[PDB]
Amino acid sequence: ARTDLPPGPFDPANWQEISVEGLVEVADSSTIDFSGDGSASDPLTAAVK
Amino acid sequence: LDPVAGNLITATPDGLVLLASGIPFPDPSSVNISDNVTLRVDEVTGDDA
């Protein structure tokens, strides 16, 4: 909320979304692996061996 | 992705990858002649064992 409010339907004029980001959950499987989580500028490099 | 045509030697078991092991060599045998009809005896190389 921006200020106190009484009961009523949702009004986008009063609230405020909170800027947020996201990540990726990576699970190495047989024959392939991954390095990092990508979103943090750690490029996702995969190796096979 | 591994193929199923059977023209394959890299079938991967548990673990990331198989690499390769003993492959089906032809084993070109030496010449045969009068195999069980004529017999050879020698001291330099023969071995009755």
Short mmCIF file of N, CA, C and O in Angstrom, two decimals:
data_model
loop_
_atom_site.label_atom_id
_atom_site.label_comp_id
_atom_site.label_asym_id
_atom_site.label_seq_id
_atom_site.Cartn_x
_atom_site.Cartn_y
_atom_site.Cartn_z
N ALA A 1 0.82 -1.20 0.00
CA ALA A 1 0.00 0.00 0.00
C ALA A 1 0.86 1.26 0.00
O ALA A 1 2.01 1.25 0.44
N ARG A 2 0.29 2.34 -0.51
CA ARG A 2 0.92 3.66 -0.42
C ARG A 2 0.43 4.43 0.79
O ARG A 2 1.21 5.13 1.44
N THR A 3 -0.86 4.34 1.09
CA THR A 3 -1.45 5.00 2.25
C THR A 3 -2.54 4.10 2.81
O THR A 3 -2.94 3.12 2.18
N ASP A 4 -3.01 4.44 4.01
CA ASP A 4 -4.12 3.71 4.60
C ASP A 4 -5.25 3.57 3.60
O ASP A 4 -5.43 4.41 2.72
N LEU A 5 -6.03 2.50 3.74
CA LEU A 5 -7.12 2.23 2.83
C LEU A 5 -8.31 1.67 3.59
O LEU A 5 -8.14 0.97 4.59
N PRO A 6 -9.53 1.97 3.14
CA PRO A 6 -10.70 1.30 3.68
C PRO A 6 -11.06 0.10 2.83
O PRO A 6 -10.46 -0.12 1.76
N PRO A 7 -12.03 -0.70 3.25
CA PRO A 7 -12.42 -1.87 2.45
C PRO A 7 -12.87 -1.45 1.06
O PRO A 7 -13.49 -0.40 0.88
N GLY A 8 -12.55 -2.28 0.07
CA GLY A 8 -12.96 -2.02 -1.29
C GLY A 8 -12.24 -2.91 -2.28
O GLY A 8 -11.31 -3.65 -1.93
N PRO A 9 -12.67 -2.87 -3.54
CA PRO A 9 -12.01 -3.68 -4.56
C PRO A 9 -10.60 -3.19 -4.83
O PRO A 9 -10.25 -2.03 -4.58
N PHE A 10 -9.78 -4.09 -5.35
CA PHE A 10 -8.39 -3.76 -5.63
C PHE A 10 -8.32 -2.56 -6.57
O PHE A 10 -9.02 -2.51 -7.58
N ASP A 11 -7.48 -1.59 -6.22
CA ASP A 11 -7.32 -0.37 -7.00
C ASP A 11 -5.84 -0.16 -7.29
O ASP A 11 -5.10 0.33 -6.41
N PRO A 12 -5.37 -0.48 -8.50
CA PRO A 12 -3.94 -0.29 -8.80
C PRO A 12 -3.44 1.12 -8.55
O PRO A 12 -2.22 1.34 -8.58
N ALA A 13 -4.32 2.09 -8.31
CA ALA A 13 -3.86 3.45 -8.07
C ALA A 13 -3.22 3.60 -6.69
O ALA A 13 -2.40 4.50 -6.49
N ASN A 14 -3.59 2.75 -5.74
CA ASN A 14 -3.13 2.88 -4.36
C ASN A 14 -1.94 1.99 -4.04
O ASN A 14 -0.99 2.44 -3.40
N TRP A 15 -1.97 0.73 -4.46
CA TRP A 15 -0.88 -0.18 -4.17
C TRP A 15 0.34 0.18 -5.01
O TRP A 15 0.38 1.19 -5.71
N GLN A 16 1.36 -0.67 -4.93
CA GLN A 16 2.55 -0.53 -5.76
C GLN A 16 3.22 -1.89 -5.89
O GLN A 16 3.58 -2.49 -4.87
N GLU A 17 3.39 -2.36 -7.12
CA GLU A 17 4.16 -3.57 -7.32
C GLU A 17 5.59 -3.35 -6.88
O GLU A 17 6.11 -2.24 -6.93
N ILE A 18 6.24 -4.43 -6.46
CA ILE A 18 7.64 -4.39 -6.06
C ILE A 18 8.46 -5.03 -7.16
O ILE A 18 8.29 -6.22 -7.46
N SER A 19 9.34 -4.25 -7.77
CA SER A 19 10.19 -4.78 -8.82
C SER A 19 10.96 -5.98 -8.30
O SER A 19 11.52 -5.95 -7.20
N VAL A 20 10.97 -7.05 -9.08
CA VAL A 20 11.61 -8.29 -8.68
C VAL A 20 12.23 -8.94 -9.90
O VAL A 20 11.91 -8.60 -11.04
N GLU A 21 13.12 -9.89 -9.66
CA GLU A 21 13.82 -10.61 -10.71
C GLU A 21 13.46 -12.09 -10.61
O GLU A 21 12.56 -12.48 -9.87
N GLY A 22 14.17 -12.91 -11.37
CA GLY A 22 13.99 -14.35 -11.28
C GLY A 22 15.29 -15.08 -11.51
O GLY A 22 16.29 -14.50 -11.96
N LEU A 23 15.27 -16.37 -11.19
CA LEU A 23 16.41 -17.24 -11.36
C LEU A 23 15.94 -18.52 -12.03
O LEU A 23 14.75 -18.67 -12.36
N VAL A 24 16.86 -19.45 -12.25
CA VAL A 24 16.56 -20.73 -12.88
C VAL A 24 17.17 -21.84 -12.04
O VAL A 24 18.32 -21.75 -11.63
N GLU A 25 16.39 -22.89 -11.80
CA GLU A 25 16.83 -24.02 -11.00
C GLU A 25 17.30 -25.12 -11.94
O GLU A 25 16.49 -25.73 -12.65
N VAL A 26 18.60 -25.37 -11.94
CA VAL A 26 19.25 -26.24 -12.91
C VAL A 26 19.67 -27.52 -12.22
O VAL A 26 20.29 -27.49 -11.15
N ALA A 27 19.33 -28.66 -12.82
CA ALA A 27 19.65 -29.97 -12.27
C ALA A 27 20.46 -30.75 -13.29
O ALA A 27 19.91 -31.20 -14.31
N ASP A 28 21.75 -30.92 -13.03
CA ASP A 28 22.58 -31.72 -13.90
C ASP A 28 22.06 -33.15 -13.95
O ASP A 28 21.80 -33.76 -12.91
N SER A 29 21.91 -33.68 -15.15
CA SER A 29 21.48 -35.05 -15.36
C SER A 29 22.62 -35.85 -15.97
O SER A 29 23.67 -35.31 -16.31
N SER A 30 22.40 -37.15 -16.12
CA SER A 30 23.43 -38.00 -16.70
C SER A 30 23.81 -37.47 -18.08
O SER A 30 22.96 -37.10 -18.88
N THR A 31 25.11 -37.45 -18.34
CA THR A 31 25.73 -37.07 -19.60
C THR A 31 25.85 -35.56 -19.78
O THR A 31 26.48 -35.13 -20.73
N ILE A 32 25.27 -34.74 -18.90
CA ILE A 32 25.38 -33.30 -19.05
C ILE A 32 25.38 -32.66 -17.67
O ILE A 32 24.67 -33.11 -16.77
N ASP A 33 26.18 -31.61 -17.52
CA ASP A 33 26.19 -30.80 -16.32
C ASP A 33 26.08 -29.34 -16.71
O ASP A 33 26.16 -28.98 -17.88
N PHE A 34 25.91 -28.48 -15.70
CA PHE A 34 25.81 -27.05 -15.92
C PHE A 34 26.66 -26.31 -14.90
O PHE A 34 26.95 -26.81 -13.81
N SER A 35 27.08 -25.10 -15.29
CA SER A 35 27.90 -24.25 -14.44
C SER A 35 27.16 -22.93 -14.22
O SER A 35 26.97 -22.16 -15.16
N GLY A 36 26.76 -22.69 -12.98
CA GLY A 36 26.15 -21.43 -12.61
C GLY A 36 24.63 -21.45 -12.66
O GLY A 36 23.98 -22.49 -12.84
N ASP A 37 24.06 -20.26 -12.48
CA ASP A 37 22.62 -20.05 -12.56
C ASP A 37 22.25 -19.00 -13.60
O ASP A 37 21.08 -18.62 -13.70
N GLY A 38 23.22 -18.51 -14.37
CA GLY A 38 22.93 -17.68 -15.52
C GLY A 38 22.49 -16.26 -15.21
O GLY A 38 23.11 -15.30 -15.68
N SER A 39 21.43 -16.12 -14.42
CA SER A 39 20.83 -14.80 -14.23
C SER A 39 21.82 -13.80 -13.66
O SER A 39 21.70 -12.60 -13.90
N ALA A 40 22.82 -14.27 -12.91
CA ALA A 40 23.81 -13.40 -12.28
C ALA A 40 25.00 -13.12 -13.18
O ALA A 40 26.11 -12.89 -12.68
N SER A 41 24.80 -13.15 -14.49
CA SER A 41 25.85 -12.96 -15.49
C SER A 41 26.86 -14.10 -15.48
O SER A 41 27.90 -13.99 -16.14
N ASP A 42 26.59 -15.18 -14.75
CA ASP A 42 27.43 -16.37 -14.80
C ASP A 42 26.95 -17.24 -15.95
O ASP A 42 25.99 -17.99 -15.78
N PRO A 43 27.58 -17.18 -17.12
CA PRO A 43 27.02 -17.87 -18.28
C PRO A 43 26.90 -19.36 -18.02
O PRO A 43 27.77 -19.97 -17.39
N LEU A 44 25.82 -19.95 -18.52
CA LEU A 44 25.59 -21.37 -18.32
C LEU A 44 26.42 -22.16 -19.32
O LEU A 44 26.05 -22.30 -20.49
N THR A 45 27.56 -22.68 -18.86
CA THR A 45 28.40 -23.56 -19.65
C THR A 45 28.19 -25.00 -19.19
O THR A 45 28.18 -25.27 -17.98
N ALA A 46 28.01 -25.90 -20.14
CA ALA A 46 27.78 -27.30 -19.86
C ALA A 46 28.94 -28.13 -20.40
O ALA A 46 29.53 -27.80 -21.43
N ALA A 47 29.25 -29.21 -19.68
CA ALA A 47 30.33 -30.10 -20.04
C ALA A 47 29.80 -31.52 -20.15
O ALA A 47 28.83 -31.89 -19.48
N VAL A 48 30.43 -32.31 -21.01
CA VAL A 48 30.06 -33.70 -21.23
C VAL A 48 31.33 -34.54 -21.12
O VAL A 48 32.28 -34.31 -21.88
N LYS A 49 31.34 -35.49 -20.20
CA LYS A 49 32.52 -36.32 -19.99
C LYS A 49 32.21 -37.40 -18.97
O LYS A 49 31.42 -37.19 -18.05
N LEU B 1 21.54 -37.41 -27.12
CA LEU B 1 20.84 -38.26 -28.08
C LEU B 1 21.80 -39.30 -28.63
O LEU B 1 22.85 -38.96 -29.17
N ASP B 2 21.43 -40.57 -28.49
CA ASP B 2 22.19 -41.65 -29.09
C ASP B 2 21.30 -42.45 -30.04
O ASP B 2 20.12 -42.66 -29.75
N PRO B 3 21.84 -42.90 -31.17
CA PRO B 3 21.00 -43.57 -32.16
C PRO B 3 20.66 -45.00 -31.75
O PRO B 3 21.24 -45.57 -30.83
N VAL B 4 19.69 -45.56 -32.47
CA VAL B 4 19.22 -46.92 -32.23
C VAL B 4 19.45 -47.83 -33.43
O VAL B 4 19.08 -49.01 -33.38
N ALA B 5 20.06 -47.32 -34.50
CA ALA B 5 20.23 -48.11 -35.71
C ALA B 5 21.12 -49.33 -35.50
O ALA B 5 21.11 -50.24 -36.33
N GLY B 6 21.90 -49.35 -34.42
CA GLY B 6 22.85 -50.42 -34.18
C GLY B 6 24.23 -50.16 -34.72
O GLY B 6 25.16 -50.90 -34.39
N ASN B 7 24.40 -49.12 -35.54
CA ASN B 7 25.72 -48.70 -36.01
C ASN B 7 26.37 -47.86 -34.91
O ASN B 7 26.84 -46.75 -35.16
N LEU B 8 26.41 -48.40 -33.70
CA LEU B 8 26.79 -47.63 -32.53
C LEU B 8 27.81 -48.40 -31.70
O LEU B 8 27.77 -49.63 -31.61
N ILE B 9 28.73 -47.65 -31.09
CA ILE B 9 29.68 -48.19 -30.13
C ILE B 9 29.73 -47.37 -28.86
O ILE B 9 30.44 -47.74 -27.92
N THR B 10 28.99 -46.27 -28.78
CA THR B 10 29.06 -45.33 -27.66
C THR B 10 27.85 -45.43 -26.75
O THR B 10 27.42 -44.43 -26.17
N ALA B 11 27.27 -46.62 -26.60
CA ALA B 11 26.14 -46.80 -25.70
C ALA B 11 26.54 -46.41 -24.28
O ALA B 11 27.41 -47.04 -23.68
N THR B 12 25.89 -45.38 -23.75
CA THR B 12 26.28 -44.81 -22.46
C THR B 12 25.57 -45.53 -21.33
O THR B 12 24.33 -45.51 -21.28
N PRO B 13 26.29 -46.16 -20.39
CA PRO B 13 25.64 -46.68 -19.19
C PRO B 13 25.49 -45.59 -18.15
O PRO B 13 25.75 -44.42 -18.44
N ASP B 14 25.06 -45.95 -16.94
CA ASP B 14 25.11 -45.00 -15.84
C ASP B 14 26.46 -44.31 -15.84
O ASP B 14 27.48 -44.88 -16.24
N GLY B 15 26.47 -43.07 -15.37
CA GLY B 15 27.58 -42.18 -15.65
C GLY B 15 27.35 -41.39 -16.92
O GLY B 15 26.48 -41.71 -17.73
N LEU B 16 28.15 -40.35 -17.09
CA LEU B 16 27.85 -39.35 -18.11
C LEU B 16 27.93 -39.93 -19.53
O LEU B 16 27.08 -39.63 -20.37
N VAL B 17 28.94 -40.76 -19.81
CA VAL B 17 29.16 -41.24 -21.17
C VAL B 17 30.01 -42.50 -21.11
O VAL B 17 30.68 -42.77 -20.12
N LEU B 18 29.99 -43.28 -22.20
CA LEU B 18 30.67 -44.57 -22.24
C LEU B 18 32.12 -44.49 -22.68
O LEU B 18 32.94 -45.30 -22.23
N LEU B 19 32.45 -43.54 -23.55
CA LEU B 19 33.73 -43.58 -24.28
C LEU B 19 33.67 -44.84 -25.15
O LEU B 19 32.61 -45.14 -25.72
N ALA B 20 34.76 -45.60 -25.26
CA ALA B 20 34.73 -46.83 -26.04
C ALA B 20 35.66 -47.86 -25.41
O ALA B 20 36.65 -47.51 -24.77
N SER B 21 35.32 -49.13 -25.60
CA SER B 21 36.11 -50.25 -25.11
C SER B 21 36.40 -51.21 -26.26
O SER B 21 36.20 -50.86 -27.43
N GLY B 22 36.89 -52.41 -25.95
CA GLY B 22 37.20 -53.39 -26.97
C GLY B 22 36.17 -53.46 -28.08
O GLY B 22 34.99 -53.72 -27.83
N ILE B 23 36.61 -53.21 -29.31
CA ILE B 23 35.73 -53.15 -30.47
C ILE B 23 35.82 -54.46 -31.25
O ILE B 23 36.82 -55.18 -31.13
N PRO B 24 34.82 -54.80 -32.07
CA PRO B 24 34.80 -56.11 -32.75
C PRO B 24 35.77 -56.21 -33.93
O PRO B 24 35.43 -56.00 -35.10
N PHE B 25 37.02 -56.54 -33.62
CA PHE B 25 38.02 -56.71 -34.65
C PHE B 25 37.75 -57.97 -35.47
O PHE B 25 37.05 -58.88 -35.01
N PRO B 26 38.28 -58.05 -36.69
CA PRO B 26 37.98 -59.21 -37.55
C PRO B 26 38.81 -60.43 -37.20
O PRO B 26 38.36 -61.57 -37.39
N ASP B 27 40.02 -60.22 -36.69
CA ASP B 27 40.95 -61.30 -36.41
C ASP B 27 41.26 -62.08 -37.69
O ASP B 27 40.84 -63.23 -37.83
N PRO B 28 41.99 -61.48 -38.63
CA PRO B 28 42.37 -62.22 -39.84
C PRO B 28 43.36 -63.33 -39.53
O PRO B 28 44.53 -63.06 -39.24
N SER B 29 42.90 -64.57 -39.60
CA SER B 29 43.76 -65.69 -39.26
C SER B 29 44.79 -65.93 -40.36
O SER B 29 44.65 -65.46 -41.49
N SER B 30 45.84 -66.67 -40.01
CA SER B 30 46.84 -67.05 -40.98
C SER B 30 46.32 -68.17 -41.87
O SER B 30 45.23 -68.72 -41.66
N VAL B 31 47.10 -68.50 -42.90
CA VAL B 31 46.64 -69.44 -43.91
C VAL B 31 46.47 -70.82 -43.30
O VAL B 31 47.27 -71.26 -42.46
N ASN B 32 45.43 -71.51 -43.74
CA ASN B 32 45.16 -72.89 -43.36
C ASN B 32 45.27 -73.78 -44.59
O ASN B 32 44.82 -73.40 -45.67
N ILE B 33 45.88 -74.95 -44.42
CA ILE B 33 46.02 -75.88 -45.53
C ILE B 33 46.22 -77.29 -44.99
O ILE B 33 47.07 -77.51 -44.11
N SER B 34 45.46 -78.25 -45.50
CA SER B 34 45.52 -79.63 -45.04
C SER B 34 45.54 -79.67 -43.51
O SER B 34 46.38 -80.31 -42.89
N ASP B 35 44.57 -78.97 -42.91
CA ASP B 35 44.65 -78.68 -41.49
C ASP B 35 44.78 -79.95 -40.66
O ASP B 35 45.79 -80.16 -39.97
N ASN B 36 43.78 -80.83 -40.71
CA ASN B 36 43.76 -82.03 -39.89
C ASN B 36 44.26 -83.26 -40.64
O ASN B 36 44.16 -84.37 -40.11
N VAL B 37 44.79 -83.09 -41.84
CA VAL B 37 45.32 -84.20 -42.62
C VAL B 37 46.83 -84.31 -42.49
O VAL B 37 47.36 -85.40 -42.32
N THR B 38 47.54 -83.18 -42.57
CA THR B 38 48.99 -83.16 -42.43
C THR B 38 49.36 -82.46 -41.13
O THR B 38 48.73 -81.48 -40.74
N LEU B 39 50.39 -82.98 -40.46
CA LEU B 39 50.81 -82.50 -39.16
C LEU B 39 52.26 -82.04 -39.22
O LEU B 39 53.05 -82.53 -40.03
N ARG B 40 52.60 -81.08 -38.36
CA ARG B 40 53.94 -80.50 -38.33
C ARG B 40 54.60 -80.78 -36.99
O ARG B 40 53.95 -80.74 -35.94
N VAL B 41 55.90 -81.05 -37.03
CA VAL B 41 56.70 -81.27 -35.83
C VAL B 41 57.95 -80.41 -35.94
O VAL B 41 58.55 -80.27 -37.01
N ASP B 42 58.33 -79.82 -34.81
CA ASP B 42 59.47 -78.90 -34.78
C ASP B 42 59.95 -78.79 -33.34
O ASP B 42 59.22 -79.13 -32.40
N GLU B 43 61.19 -78.33 -33.19
CA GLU B 43 61.76 -78.03 -31.88
C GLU B 43 61.92 -76.55 -31.63
O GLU B 43 61.90 -76.13 -30.47
N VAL B 44 62.08 -75.74 -32.68
CA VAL B 44 62.33 -74.32 -32.49
C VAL B 44 61.11 -73.63 -31.88
O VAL B 44 61.24 -72.81 -30.97
N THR B 45 59.92 -73.96 -32.37
CA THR B 45 58.71 -73.24 -32.00
C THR B 45 57.56 -74.12 -31.54
O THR B 45 56.68 -73.62 -30.84
N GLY B 46 57.54 -75.40 -31.89
CA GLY B 46 56.42 -76.24 -31.52
C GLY B 46 56.24 -76.32 -30.02
O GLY B 46 57.16 -76.10 -29.23
N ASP B 47 55.00 -76.63 -29.62
CA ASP B 47 54.66 -76.76 -28.21
C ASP B 47 53.48 -77.72 -28.11
O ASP B 47 52.34 -77.34 -28.39
N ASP B 48 53.76 -78.96 -27.68
CA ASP B 48 52.71 -79.97 -27.63
C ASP B 48 51.61 -79.61 -26.64
O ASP B 48 50.54 -80.22 -26.69
N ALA B 49 51.85 -78.65 -25.75
CA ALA B 49 50.84 -78.29 -24.76
C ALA B 49 49.51 -77.96 -25.43
O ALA B 49 48.45 -78.44 -25.01
#
